Amino acid sequence: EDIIAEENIVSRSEFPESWLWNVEDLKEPPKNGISTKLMNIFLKDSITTWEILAVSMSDKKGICVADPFEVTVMQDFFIDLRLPYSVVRNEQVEIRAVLYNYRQNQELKVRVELLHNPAFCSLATTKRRHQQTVTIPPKSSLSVPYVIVPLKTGLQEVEVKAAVYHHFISDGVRKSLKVVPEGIRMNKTVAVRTLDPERLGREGVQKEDIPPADLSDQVPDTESETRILLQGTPVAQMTEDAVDAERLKHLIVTPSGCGEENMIGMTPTVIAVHYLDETEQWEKFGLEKRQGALELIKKGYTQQLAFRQPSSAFAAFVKRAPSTWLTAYVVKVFSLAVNLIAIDSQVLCGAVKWLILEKQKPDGVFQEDAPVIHQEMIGGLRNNNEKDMALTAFVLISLQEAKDICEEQVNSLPGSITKAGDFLEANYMNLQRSYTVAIAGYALAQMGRLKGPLLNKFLTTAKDKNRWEDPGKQLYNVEATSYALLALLQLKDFDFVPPVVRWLNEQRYYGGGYGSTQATFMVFQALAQYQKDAPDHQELNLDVSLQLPSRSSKITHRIHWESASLLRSEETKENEGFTVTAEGKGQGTLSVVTMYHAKAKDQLTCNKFDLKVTIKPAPKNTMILEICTRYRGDQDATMSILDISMMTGFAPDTDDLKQLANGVDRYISKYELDKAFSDRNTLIIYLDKVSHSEDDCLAFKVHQYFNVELIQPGAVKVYAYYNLEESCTRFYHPEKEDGKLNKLCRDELCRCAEENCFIQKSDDKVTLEERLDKACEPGVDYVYKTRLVKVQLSNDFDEYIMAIEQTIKSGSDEVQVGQQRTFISPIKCREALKLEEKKHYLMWGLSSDFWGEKPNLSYIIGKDTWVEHWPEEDECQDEENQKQCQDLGAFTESMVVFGCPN
Amino acid sequence: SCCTIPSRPINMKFKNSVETDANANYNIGDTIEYLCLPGYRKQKMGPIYAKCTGTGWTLFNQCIKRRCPSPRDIDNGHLDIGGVDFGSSITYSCNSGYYLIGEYKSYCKLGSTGSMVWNPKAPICESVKCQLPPSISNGRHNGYNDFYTDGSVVTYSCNSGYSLIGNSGVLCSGGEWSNPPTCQIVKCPHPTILNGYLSSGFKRSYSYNDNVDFTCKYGYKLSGSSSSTCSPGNTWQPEL
Amino acid sequence: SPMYSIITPNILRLESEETMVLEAHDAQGDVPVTVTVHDFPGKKLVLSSEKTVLTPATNHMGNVTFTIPANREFKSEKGRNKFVTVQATFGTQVVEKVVLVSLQSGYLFIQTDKTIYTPGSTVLYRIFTVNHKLLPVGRTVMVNIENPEGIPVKQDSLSSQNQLGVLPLSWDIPELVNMGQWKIRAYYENSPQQVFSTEFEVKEYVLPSFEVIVEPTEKFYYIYNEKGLEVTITARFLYGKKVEGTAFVIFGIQDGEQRISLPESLKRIPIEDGSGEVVLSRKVLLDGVQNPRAEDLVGKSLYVSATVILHSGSDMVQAERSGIPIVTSPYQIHFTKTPKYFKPGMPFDLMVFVTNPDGSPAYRVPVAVQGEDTVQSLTQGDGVAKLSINTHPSQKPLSITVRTKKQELSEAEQATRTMQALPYSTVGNSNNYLHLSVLRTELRPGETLNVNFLLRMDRAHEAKIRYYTYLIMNKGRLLKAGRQVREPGQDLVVLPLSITTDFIPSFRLVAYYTLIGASGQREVVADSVWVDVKDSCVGSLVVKSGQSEDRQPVPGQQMTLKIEGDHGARVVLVAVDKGVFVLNKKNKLTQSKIWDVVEKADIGCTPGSGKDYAGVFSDAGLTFTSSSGQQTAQRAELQCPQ
Ligand SMILES: *[C@H]1O[C@H](CO[C@@H]2O[C@@H](C)[C@@H](O)[C@@H](O)[C@@H]2O)[C@@H](O[C@@H]2O[C@H](CO)[C@@H](O[C@@H]3O[C@H](CO)[C@@H](O)[C@H](O)[C@@H]3O)[C@H](O)[C@H]2NC(C)=O)[C@H](O)[C@H]1NC(C)=O
Ligand SMILES: *[C@@H]1O[C@H](CO)[C@@H](O[C@@H]2O[C@H](CO)[C@@H](O)[C@H](O)[C@H]2NC(C)=O)[C@H](O)[C@H]1NC(C)=O
Ligand SMILES: [Cl-]
Ligand SMILES: [Cl-]
Ligand SMILES: [Cl-]
Numbered sequence A: 001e002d003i004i005a006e007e008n009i010v011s012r013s014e015f016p017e018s019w020l021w022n023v024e025d026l027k028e029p030p031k032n033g034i035s036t037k038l039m040n041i042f043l044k045d046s047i048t049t050w051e052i053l054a055v056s057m058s059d060k061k062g063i064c065v066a067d068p069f070e071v072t073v074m075q076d077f078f079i080d081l082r083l084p085y086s087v088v089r090n091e092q093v094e095i096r097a098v099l100y101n102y103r104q105n106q107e108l109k110v111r112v113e114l115l116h117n118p119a120f121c122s123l124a125t126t127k128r129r130h131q132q133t134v135t136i137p138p139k140s141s142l143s144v145p146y147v148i149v150p151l152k153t154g155l156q157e158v159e160v161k162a163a164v165y166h167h168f169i170s171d172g173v174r175k176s177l178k179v180v181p182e183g184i185r186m187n188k189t190v191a192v193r194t195l196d197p198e199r200l201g202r203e204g205v206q207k208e209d210i211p212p213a214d215l216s217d218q219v220p221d222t223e224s225e226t227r228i229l230l231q232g233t234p235v236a237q238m239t240e241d242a243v244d245a246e247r248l249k250h251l252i253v254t255p256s257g258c259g260e261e262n263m264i265g266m267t268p269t270v271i272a273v274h275y276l277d278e279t280e281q282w283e284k285f286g287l288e289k290r291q292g293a294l295e296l297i298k299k300g301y302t303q304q305l306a307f308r309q310p311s312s313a314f315a316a317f318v319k320r321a322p323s324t325w326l327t328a329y330v331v332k333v334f335s336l337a338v339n340l341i342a343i344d345s346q347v348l349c350g351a352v353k354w355l356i357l358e359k360q361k362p363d364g365v366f367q368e369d370a371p372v373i374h375q376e377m378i379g380g381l382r383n384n385n386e387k388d389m390a391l392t393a394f395v396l397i398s399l400q401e402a403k404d405i406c407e408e409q410v411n412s413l414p415g416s417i418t419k420a421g422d423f424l425e426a427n428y429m430n431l432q433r434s435y436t437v438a439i440a441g442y443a444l445a446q447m448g449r450l451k452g453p454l455l456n457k458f459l460t461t462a463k464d465k466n467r468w469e470d471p472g473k474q475l476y477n478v479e480a481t482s483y484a485l486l487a488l489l490q491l492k493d494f495d496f497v498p499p500v501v502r503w504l505n506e507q508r509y510y511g512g513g514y515g516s517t518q519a520t521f522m523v524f525q526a527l528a529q530y531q532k533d534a535p536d537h538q539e540l541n542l543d544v545s546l547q548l549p550s551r552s553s554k555i556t557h558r559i560h561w562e563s564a565s566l567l568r569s570e571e572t573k574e575n576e577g578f579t580v581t582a583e584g585k586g587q588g589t590l591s592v593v594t595m596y597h598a599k600a601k602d603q604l605t606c607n608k609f610d611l612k613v614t615i616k617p618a619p620k621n622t623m624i625l626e627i628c629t630r631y632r633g634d635q636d637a638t639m640s641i642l643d644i645s646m647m648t649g650f651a652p653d654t655d656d657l658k659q660l661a662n663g664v665d666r667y668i669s670k671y672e673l674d675k676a677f678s679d680r681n682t683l684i685i686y687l688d689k690v691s692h693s694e695d696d697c698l699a700f701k702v703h704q705y706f707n708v709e710l711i712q713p714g715a716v717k718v719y720a721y722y723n724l725e726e727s728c729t730r731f732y733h734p735e736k737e738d739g740k741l742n743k744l745c746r747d748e749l750c751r752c753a754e755e756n757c758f759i760q761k762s763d764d765k766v767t768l769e770e771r772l773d774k775a776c777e778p779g780v781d782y783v784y785k786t787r788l789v790k791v792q793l794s795n796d797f798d799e800y801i802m803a804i805e806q807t808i809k810s811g812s813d814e815v816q817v818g819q820q821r822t823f824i825s826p827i828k829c830r831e832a833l834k835l836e837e838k839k840h841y842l843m844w845g846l847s848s849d850f851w852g853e854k855p856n857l858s859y860i861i862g863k864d865t866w867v868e869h870w871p872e873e874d875e876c877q878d879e880e881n882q883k884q885c886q887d888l889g890a891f892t893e894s895m896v897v898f899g900c901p902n
Numbered sequence B: 001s002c003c004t005i006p007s008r009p010i011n012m013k014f015k016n017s018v019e020t021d022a023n024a025n026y027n028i029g030d031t032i033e034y035l036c037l038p039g040y041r042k043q044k045m046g047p048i049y050a051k052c053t054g055t056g057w058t059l060f061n062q063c064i065k066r067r068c069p070s071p072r073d074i075d076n077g078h079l080d081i082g083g084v085d086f087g088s089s090i091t092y093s094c095n096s097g098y099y100l101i102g103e104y105k106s107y108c109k110l111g112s113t114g115s116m117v118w119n120p121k122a123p124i125c126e127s128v129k130c131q132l133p134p135s136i137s138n139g140r141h142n143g144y145n146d147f148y149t150d151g152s153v154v155t156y157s158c159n160s161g162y163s164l165i166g167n168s169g170v171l172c173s174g175g176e177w178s179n180p181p182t183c184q185i186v187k188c189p190h191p192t193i194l195n196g197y198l199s200s201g202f203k204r205s206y207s208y209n210d211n212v213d214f215t216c217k218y219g220y221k222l223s224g225s226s227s228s229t230c231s232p233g234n235t236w237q238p239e240l
Numbered sequence C: 001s002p003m004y005s006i007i008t009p010n011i012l013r014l015e016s017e018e019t020m021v022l023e024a025h026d027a028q029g030d031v032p033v034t035v036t037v038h039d040f041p042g043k044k045l046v047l048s049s050e051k052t053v054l055t056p057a058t059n060h061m062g063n064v065t066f067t068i069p070a071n072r073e074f075k076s077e078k079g080r081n082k083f084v085t086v087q088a089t090f091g092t093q094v095v096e097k098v099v100l101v102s103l104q105s106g107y108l109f110i111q112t113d114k115t116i117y118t119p120g121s122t123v124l125y126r127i128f129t130v131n132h133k134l135l136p137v138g139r140t141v142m143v144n145i146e147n148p149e150g151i152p153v154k155q156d157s158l159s160s161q162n163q164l165g166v167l168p169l170s171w172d173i174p175e176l177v178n179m180g181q182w183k184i185r186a187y188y189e190n191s192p193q194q195v196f197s198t199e200f201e202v203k204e205y206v207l208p209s210f211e212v213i214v215e216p217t218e219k220f221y222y223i224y225n226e227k228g229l230e231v232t233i234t235a236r237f238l239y240g241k242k243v244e245g246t247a248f249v250i251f252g253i254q255d256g257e258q259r260i261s262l263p264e265s266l267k268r269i270p271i272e273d274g275s276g277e278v279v280l281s282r283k284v285l286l287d288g289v290q291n292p293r294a295e296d297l298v299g300k301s302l303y304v305s306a307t308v309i310l311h312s313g314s315d316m317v318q319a320e321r322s323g324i325p326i327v328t329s330p331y332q333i334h335f336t337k338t339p340k341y342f343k344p345g346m347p348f349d350l351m352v353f354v355t356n357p358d359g360s361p362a363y364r365v366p367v368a369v370q371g372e373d374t375v376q377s378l379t380q381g382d383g384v385a386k387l388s389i390n391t392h393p394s395q396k397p398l399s400i401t402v403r404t405k406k407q408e409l410s411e412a413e414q415a416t417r418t419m420q421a422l423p424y425s426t427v428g429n430s431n432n433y434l435h436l437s438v439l440r441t442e443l444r445p446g447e448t449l450n451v452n453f454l455l456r457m458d459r460a461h462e463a464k465i466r467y468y469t470y471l472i473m474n475k476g477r478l479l480k481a482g483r484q485v486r487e488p489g490q491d492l493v494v495l496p497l498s499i500t501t502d503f504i505p506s507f508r509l510v511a512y513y514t515l516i517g518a519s520g521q522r523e524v525v526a527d528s529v530w531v532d533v534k535d536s537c538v539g540s541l542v543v544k545s546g547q548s549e550d551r552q553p554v555p556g557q558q559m560t561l562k563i564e565g566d567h568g569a570r571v572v573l574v575a576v577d578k579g580v581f582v583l584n585k586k587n588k589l590t591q592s593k594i595w596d597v598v599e600k601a602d603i604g605c606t607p608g609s610g611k612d613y614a615g616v617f618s619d620a621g622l623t624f625t626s627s628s629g630q631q632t633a634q635r636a637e638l639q640c641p642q
């Protein structure tokens, strides 16, 4: 006509919050240093202002964030369809289509329509449109309320169109909204399991069986999600404190001497640098100082070279016979100092070669023929008893220290180490002194030859399990205990270590002094090595698999120390029990929580407000609308809002509204009162408060200015200003007290009421050919013969359980043979239906009469569904009538044997 | 009479099919009504029609192409929109590290129920998977994730005494991993120099890619400027 | 006796270009220098080796640039402290300094497409990977997504190689998700301790059709203001039209974290022509708090909440304006830009920074030094005034008080601040000092700034100083270095310095001279100055309309976007609905944020000067070392003290 047809209107539908997520490049040739890019973009459908932000990255210029660029997209006439974030299924709701006219001098006469959607009960249907004709003054807006009922979950579409009479102008809006199931979302923790495979599992394997969640109050036909959460729990090891840097200040010494003296002065400086490097304590000590330490060391070394004999051995004086001990010691120290300064390979390895070929007996023992002058400097070796074992152990240790440096130069080294090791092993069990036990123990531990009874003697020998001691010098015991610490470290026996380390530190010995060289060197080497071998955290290496009955292949998660915090999640829709298996070393946490929708009583709705709304005939049609609200809090509510929308073709009484506005403790805008009777069908009343102890009530008259065949129920919403979520909505209608749009429900599913009742016929009776003609029609999806097993009652429906005895024609549904299907009929259609249990029936019908999906799928007995009584065989054979039974037989025969033709 | 017989205007048909059959003589002021062909709609308010004037037929109103819905963007893809009117096309691209599944080109056409639609339906962009992080002889990378995508990095590490050769990091690109490092045991025979003291790098053990410099008292051999390297296969390729 | 010196940054960064400056004093002929960097203390590997010969023609000044190997063979952890030994050898003469190492290798910046997201939607983000020069770089980045609880839900290891410094990513928010503030946290693989982050909110919502702007008539509340706090409410549709409706406005007090609502402040006002007015009365405010003394409210802040409802009732928008500070003065004074060390007998320069209570700079505000006649100084655009006081030569600590001189204000209303400056300590009572000065006008690239060098020292040993040497610190590294020549008898010398985009956003100039002391020992005298540079993008990027029709576009319409930028630049874009910002405007990415990240990472920790020469060097983030044993102390911490 003079208005744009609905079909011709293409609704705006593109409303993204963000877009233009684009990567571009300024490839264009630049004038000056700048390159201009012209982009063609298609704007979205939103009516708003877009902020366009650009960030550039250049290899010469760097990163640059541009100032935001705005684009305003505007229209003189449009629909703003205001949708909530989500709506509950089967729950009546009101939405607003607000129409905007921003023309200055031109009013707009507009027809607006809510499109039909099978997923919503609304006014509009397939057979009939929901159109309204309204007028919008210039520079004004108009609220058009639509009352709908969402029928299915998920994203659902709402479309509103509007066109202008006598103007080639239109607009449409197509939006989606989330439809969610009824009830409240709950998280239920199925299980919490600590994972400790070594502590909680046999053979290093921990198995936990997780049961299915008990969903007793779960809403029917609701998806549930089970979440499996894996996490690693990091455990940091506690290591003993490192010796303070300041406390090694005295260990820095200038070497002087004397083949022996030089080594005595060289010992502390070398071991101090060794300990400081290991513990990285150079910061508190002073970084600049390290250089210094070095050349003292260098000095010592150089000086020591003066006392090197032609055999490559060492002694106090060149004239003096060479010492086995002093030579082996020079090896020990130089080897430990090989990182710090350049040491001649020939000197060290020469000394080693001399020790082996000249000083080692056939049994592996090392012997001293020219003892040092300074007995003090040999510490624990001073004791006359068990000299062979102790000295062989000492020299052997010096050899282990030099193995990596001298293996190619010295061929005799592997054999010597082995030979010494044999002598140590052979006579170890006879040792009576803690010192010898400890040092020989360390020597054997270096070769992995400290095991069994030997290891037990070594550990047993320790007093209080913290130290190795003997009567005599305390220093000897410190030295010995240091050796045993080194042994334990070599063995990786970390459980035995902490008391021993604590004891050494407890002694508070920091070397330096007369007769201190061995205790100094050993205690600091042992502590340095402790720091080196110490673990900062416990080992976390877990392999965790979960086996799900739904999935053939198991899911495997490896939890390591770096990724220990990382939360791993696996989700299953099925509420099935499963098993989790954990392997490896470490600690973990398993948590299984199932999220479901739980049926809730009392009802979620109107928990903050009680709202009663009433519409009654008043003593040109006018009615009285009464609204009674009560806050459900402990005290009266603050300032609140009543949002009222009129029934179709109704407007509030102006005088009543004015008197209400003048009433104290409520407010109605000058804007509302100024507005004409039409076309505004919405009214907001601001309350200064809402009582919590009694209903606050008000009432006003509403006049029916426009008459319509179908009247949309009006609505009232109450909420406090600070919280829009905590509202209550009531509907009102003259024909329906509840204000609820007519609908039928079966279980959790609801459909809009329709005139689709089974048609009862006929007195005159019918022919075979009519059955053949109707059933072979393309619209017919199924033709069955079946028997009524059981008749049941529902709130809105009668249910008939039919076991399909024969599928004459099969539909999309496959009933196979002897399966059961439920046929339902609205209560208003009872008189037409005549069904009895245990009796046979020929039925057929449309696919449009299907409702829901299997399980509990229903066949609806509507107007187009055929249902005929089938006489039993015995009954079939008798008169009244043989005709019907023969006709059913022929119908059957024709239908299965030949079917329908194209 | 004066007018004539008109052929259908483009994008239009006769409102009355019978019209052409009627072969009526047209007088001045006579009108013929048209309808817009499928995929089109009238430009202006009211009917679309022609009037016979003394000087031929005169057209009132017009038919112009109907319009498709505004296209949705695609995740991890770009949209090239030619237009939105009848017969326009949009071509779909996928960002790097993503491949396109479904149709790469779509057109605005007439669909059943007589509504303008985009056909075929829009394609989906899917991440190119890498997967199968390669194992390394005597070394473990880590990983524990699948599937890896473009840009994903896995770092290799050899445990124990083995030395890692080449880059420890592998990048997944185009579903294909970069070349894994090999970790092999390597040892280095201590450097020997006649008349040289050594300057630095004097470690007890020499495994992989260690370095040293030489300081020497005068009369020293070889040339020139020394320095050294340690190379795989225990070979040492430069200037002793 | 010739002296050899080396200067490097106080802190050395992995994978970053660093420069070492070598100087010879009183040396004749070419000088051969070899510089190596080693790991401390292990000296296991050579990190870098370079050589250079100082020629007499270049004025005996040299540099060697080196990048510590990315390899980071020296293992991180337990975090700190890593060190390297830096060695320079000049003709068989060795000079070595141990320097601190920072594992940080550059900057990351994270950009999401929006500030807030619904469950079930997708967060689009981009990680910009740059070095300390702010140039694109190809590296390995660890990325985590953290829930409101702080737990990482997703962990990826990615590379930006071949990505031109832009790493485009996305994360899918589950439909069932914990609401709250979520974090994207990324770091360079090599530098695990330096974590860069951004935040986004996850919440169920719909976009509003209009915005509400609540603005007080003053950025603060004067505690003795009888009028109370006046607030204007503005409401307008995102498409520009004005709103008609009803607003509910309520006030509260914020003290630290706690918030105290003021129930009686609740007012309901009409919004006409997009505007509304509302007042918080002094009596209501003062009655809200338990304490009867009003002065106790000073230092606290007020907040205003406004809820606007359209007359249709179809849409509602809540908006808050908070941190309106309660004051006794509309101004604050800050000495954050002035040196805390003076040199006795030489003019001391104060760099007074005057702000509004919201933190913003204050324009044309008069400022003077208390205890001193005149010395009034106005404020620049950046809210900066320059003052100078002559100091008497003496080791007596300096106490300076600065007050505002605003004409329309009472004396109780004026702002005041006091600072203490210590005497520069010369070596062996030498009474020698160097002083640097600058014009302090608003500074921009493409302009040259004169740097003034003034020395006071005994005239007997004065003749010895032929030159000064200056080092330019910027973004944590040396950018430039050079020499300024001074004839004997010349107290003041001027160096003109061209300023470029490299100087953005600020730089420090450190100048020093050396001589043979009256002790016969070597003597080094230094001073440092800090200068701000106007922030901007290095280069340019502009987005505007290409159509230029000047007529507003309609939905679905095509338009032309014009982008102007540097050639070859990679430009990433996003288009966002303003309503999103109505819901959340936190964590937007800007250039200023970038410059802030850069300024926070700075090595230099002071505005200038020092206790001694070594103090001056270290304070500006430098290590000086000489053959004669004059060197800066070792630096203990990576973070700037305070
Ligand atoms: C070391 O730094 C010098 C700068 O001057 C020096 O800096 C100190 C750190 C000491 O080393 C002192 O000896 C001295 O004061 C760098 O010299 C620079 O050279 C570049 C070219 O490489 C110059 O840049 C430009 O070059 C183009 C041609 O490519 C010309 O058109 C320009 O006019 C300009 O000359 C630059 O001017 C010059 N100085 C500056 C200000 O940087 C030198 O590069 C650097 N050495 C190393 C190894 O990087
Ligand atoms: C699972 O749901 C429970 C109960 O609803 C959550 O517990 C509440 O969480 C909300 C925020 O989502 C808090 O405001 C409440 O204070 C919490 N109540 C209690 C008693 O804890 C719980 O947070 C959910 N689980 C997870 C993983 O967040
Ligand atoms: Cl586009
Ligand atoms: Cl040998
Ligand atoms: Cl038509």
Ligand SMILES: [Cl-]
Pocket: B069, B116, B117, B118
């Ligand atoms: Cl479509």
Ligand SMILES: [Cl-]
Pocket: C059, C467, C483, C484, C485
């Ligand atoms: Cl010079």
Ligand code: NA
Pocket: A079, A080, A081, A082, A083, A173
């Ligand atoms: Na809308």
Ligand code: NA
Pocket: C505, C506, C532, C533, C534, C535
């Ligand atoms: Na700046």
